Amino acid sequence: ESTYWEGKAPPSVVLGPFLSKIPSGVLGPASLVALIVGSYCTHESNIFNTLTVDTIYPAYVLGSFLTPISWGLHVAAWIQKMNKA
Amino acid sequence: AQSKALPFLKAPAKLDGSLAGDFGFDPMGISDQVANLKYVRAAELKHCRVAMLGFLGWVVQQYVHLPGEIYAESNPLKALTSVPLLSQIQIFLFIGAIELATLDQTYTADKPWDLGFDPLNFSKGKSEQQMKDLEVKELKNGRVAMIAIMGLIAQTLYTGVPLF
Amino acid sequence: KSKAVPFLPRPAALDGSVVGDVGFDPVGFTSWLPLSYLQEAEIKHCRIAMLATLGWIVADFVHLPGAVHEVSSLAAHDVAVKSGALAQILIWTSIAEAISVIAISQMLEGSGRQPGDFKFDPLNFAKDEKSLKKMQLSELKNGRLAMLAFSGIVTQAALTGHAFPY
Ligand code: CLA
Ligand SMILES: C/C(C=C=C1C(C)(C)C[C@H](O)C[C@@]1(C)O)=C/C=C/C(C)=C/C=C/C=C(C)/C=C/C=C(/C=C/[C@@]12O[C@]1(C)C[C@@H](O)CC2(C)C)CO
Ligand SMILES: CC(/C=C/C=C(C)/C=C/[C@@]12O[C@]1(C)C[C@@H](O)CC2(C)C)=C\C=C\C=C(C)\C=C\C=C(C)\C=C\[C@@]12O[C@]1(C)C[C@@H](O)CC2(C)C
Ligand SMILES: CC(/C=C/C=C(C)/C=C/[C@@]12O[C@]1(C)C[C@@H](O)CC2(C)C)=C\C=C\C=C(C)\C=C\C=C(C)\C=C\[C@@]12O[C@]1(C)C[C@@H](O)CC2(C)C
Numbered sequence: 001e002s003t004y005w006e007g008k009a010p011p012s013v014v015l016g017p018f019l020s021k022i023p024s025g026v027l028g029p030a031s032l033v034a035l036i037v038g039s040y041c042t043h044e045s046n047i048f049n050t051l052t053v054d055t056i057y058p059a060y061v062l063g064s065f066l067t068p069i070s071w072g073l074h075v076a077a078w079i080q081k082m083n084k085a
Numbered sequence: 086a087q088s089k090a091l092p093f094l095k096a097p098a099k100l101d102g103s104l105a106g107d108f109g110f111d112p113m114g115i116s117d118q119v120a121n122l123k124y125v126r127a128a129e130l131k132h133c134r135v136a137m138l139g140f141l142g143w144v145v146q147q148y149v150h151l152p153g154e155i156y157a158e159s160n161p162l163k164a165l166t167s168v169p170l171l172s173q174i175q176i177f178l179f180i181g182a183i184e185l186a187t188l189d190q191t192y193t194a195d196k197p198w199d200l201g202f203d204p205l206n207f208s209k210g211k212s213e214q215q216m217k218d219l220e221v222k223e224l225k226n227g228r229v230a231m232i233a234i235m236g237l238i239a240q241t242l243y244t245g246v247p248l249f
Numbered sequence: 250k251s252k253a254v255p256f257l258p259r260p261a262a263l264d265g266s267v268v269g270d271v272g273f274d275p276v277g278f279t280s281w282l283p284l285s286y287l288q289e290a291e292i293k294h295c296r297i298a299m300l301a302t303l304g305w306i307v308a309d310f311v312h313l314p315g316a317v318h319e320v321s322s323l324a325a326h327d328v329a330v331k332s333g334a335l336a337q338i339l340i341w342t343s344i345a346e347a348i349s350v351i352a353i354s355q356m357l358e359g360s361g362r363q364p365g366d367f368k369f370d371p372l373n374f375a376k377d378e379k380s381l382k383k384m385q386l387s388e389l390k391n392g393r394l395a396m397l398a399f400s401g402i403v404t405q406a407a408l409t410g411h412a413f414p415y
C-alpha cells in the first residue's frame with residue numbers, strides 16, 4: 001500500500017495489480033499504438049468524413065475511446081520505466 | 086461449501102443451524118445487513134402464507150364462484166376490477182385490523198412470525214423435530230407458491246389465460 | 250526450461266497443475282492475470298466450445314421436432330432468436346454467469362474453490378484424486394480441441410454452404 005510518494009516517480013502500486021506487472025517496454029509501444037489507432041478512428045468517424053446517422057461505426061467509436069485511454073497507458077509506461085520495470 | 090442450495094459458495098455468517106428452511110441461500114449477502122433474521126423470516130413467512138392463499142384462490146376462482154353475479158368473473162385480474170369496491174375494502178379493512186396488532190408485535194418479538202394461530206391445535210403434542218419438519222414444509226410450500234403465484238400473474242398479464 | 254516450448258524459458262507462474270501444465274505461455278499471460286482466473290476462463294471456453302461443436306454437428310444432421318427447427322445451424326441463430334428459444338437460453342445463462350461472478354470472486358479472495366469447479370458430479374464419474382486429475386486433463390484437452398474445431402466449423406460453414414465436411 002502507501003500510494004503516497006515524494007521521490008521522482010510514484011511506486012508501481014498506484015497502477016493497480018494489473019498494470020503494476022506490465023513491463024514498460026510493453027506499455028510504451030502499446031500506448032503509442034493505442035494513441036495512433038484512436039486518433040485515426042476519430043479522424044475517420046469525423047473530420048475526414050462528416051458524421052451521419054447511417055455512419056456511426058462502433059469500431060471507430062470504440063476506437064476513439066483508445067485516445068483517452070492511451071493517455072493512461074503511457075502515463076503508466078513512464079511510471080513503470082522510472083521504477084525499474 | 087456450506088450452502089446446500091449453492092454447494093459451491095460459502096454461506097453468510099447469519100445462515101446457520103436453527104431457523105428451519107436454512108439452506109445457505111443468500112448469495113447477495115442480504116443477511117449481512119439485517120441485525121437478525123427475525124424480521125426477514127417474518128416477512129418471508131407472511132409472503133409464503135399470502136402466496137399459498139393466493140394460489141388456492143386463483144385455482145378456486147378459476148373453477149368455483151359464489152352464487153352472486155358480481156363474483157362471476159373467471160379471470161382473477163379481471164375480477165379485481167369487476168368485483169365491487171365494497172367487497173375489496175372490507176377485505177382490506179379485515180387485513181389491516183389483523184395487521185396493526187401484528188405491526189406492534191413484529192418489530193420487537195423474538196418470533197414475529199408466531200402469531201399464535203393454531204385453532205385446530207395441530208402443534209399441541211408435537212415434538213421439536215416434528216415441529217421443525219412442519220416449519221420446513223410450510224416454508225417449502227410457500228416458496229413454491231410464491232413462484233407459482235407470480236407466474237400466474239405474469240401469464241395472465243401477458244397472454245390472458247389465467248391457468249395453463 | 251519449458252516443456253511445451255523448448256526454446257523459450259518455462260513460465261514463472263506455471264510449475265504444477267493437474268489442468269495440463271506443460272508450460273505453454275510464450276506471451277507470459279500468467280504474469281498479467283492470476284493463474285486461477287485464466288484457468289476458470291479456459292475451462293469455461295472449453296465447456297462452451299464442446300457443447301457448441303456437438304450441437305452444431307447434431308443440429309445439422311437430426312434436428313427438426315417442429316417447423317421452425319428446419320434450419321442448417323448457420324441461419325439457425327437469427328431464426329431461433331426470432332422464435333424466442335435463444336432468449337430463454339440467454340436468460341438462464343445470464344443467471345448462471347451472475348452466480349459465477351460470486352464463485353470467481355469467492356476464489357481469488359480465499360475459500361478453496363478450484364478453477365472451473367462447480368461440484369457438479371451427479372453421476373460420480375470421478376471417484377478419487379487420480380481419476381479427477383486424469384479427467385481434468387482429458388476435459389481440458391477435449392475442450393481445446395473443441396475450441397479449434399468449432400472455429401474451423403464456423404469459418405468453413407461461412408466460407409461456403411455445405412454439410413458435415415464443411
Ligand atoms: C418476499 C420474498 C422473500 C423473502 C423476504 C425471503 C427471505 C429470506 N429467505 Mg427466501 N426465498 C424466496 C422468497 C423470499 N425469501 C423464494 C421465492 C424462494 C424460492 C426460490 C426462496 C428460497 C430460499 C432459500 C432456499 C433460503 C431462503 C432464505 C431466506 C432468509 C435469508 C435470506 C435473506 O435475508 O434474504 C432476504 C430476501 C429479500 C429481502 C428479498 C429481496 C428481493 C430480491 C431482490 C428478489 C428480486 C426478484 C427475484 C430476483 C426474481 C423474482 C421474480 C420471479 C422470477 C419470482 C430470509 C428470511 C435462507 C434461509 O432459510 O435463511 C434463514 C435459505 O436458505 N430463501
Ligand atoms: C418445447 C421445446 C421446443 C418446441 C416445440 C415442441 C412442442 C417440442 C414441438 C413443436 O412441434 C415445436 C415447438 C417449437 O413448439 C423445447 C426446447 C428445447 C430445450 C428446452 C432445450 C434447451 C437447450 C439448452 C441449451 C442449448 C443450453 C446451452 C448451454 C450453455 C451453457 C453455458 C455455460 O457457460 C455457462 C453459462 C457456464 C459455463 O461455466 C459453462 C456452460 C455450462 C457451458 C450455453 O452456452
Ligand atoms: C416470488 C416472490 C419473491 C421472490 C424473491 C426471491 C426469489 C429472492 C431471492 C433472493 O433474496 C434471496 C432469497 C437471497 C438473496 O441473497 C438472493 C436473492 C435471489 C435475491 C414473492 C412472491 C409473492 C407473491 C405474493 C405476495 C402473492 C400474493 C397474492 C395476492 C396479493 C392475491 C391476489 C388475488 O387477490 C387478487 C389480487 C385477485 C384475485 O382474483 C386473485 C387473487 C390471487 C386471490
Ligand atoms: C394452500 C396451502 C396451505 C394451506 C394451509 C392452511 C390454510 C392451513 C391452516 C391451518 O394450519 C394452520 C395455519 C393452523 C391450524 O391450527 C389450523 C389450520 C386452518 C388447519 C398450501 C399451498 C401450496 C401451494 C403450492 C405449493 C402451489 C404450487 C403451485 C404450482 C407449482 C403451480 C404451477 C402452475 O401455476 C403455474 C405456475 C402456471 C400454470 O399455468 C400451470 C401450473 C402448473 C398450474
Ligand SMILES: CC(/C=C/C=C(C)/C=C/[C@@]12O[C@]1(C)C[C@@H](O)CC2(C)C)=C\C=C\C=C(C)\C=C\C=C(C)\C=C\[C@@]12O[C@]1(C)C[C@@H](O)CC2(C)C
Nearest residue numbers: 299300302303369370371372373374395398401402414415
Ligand atoms: C460435448 C462433449 C462432452 C459433453 C459431456 C457432458 C455434457 C457431460 C456432463 C456430465 O459429466 C458431467 C459434466 C458430470 C456427470 O456426473 C454428469 C454428466 C451430465 C453426464 C464433448 C464434445 C467434444 C467435441 C469435440 C472433441 C469436437 C471435435 C471436432 C473435431 C475433432 C473436428 C472436426 C472437423 O475435422 C472435421 C471432422 C471436419 C471438418 O470439416 C470440420 C472440423 C470441425 C474441423
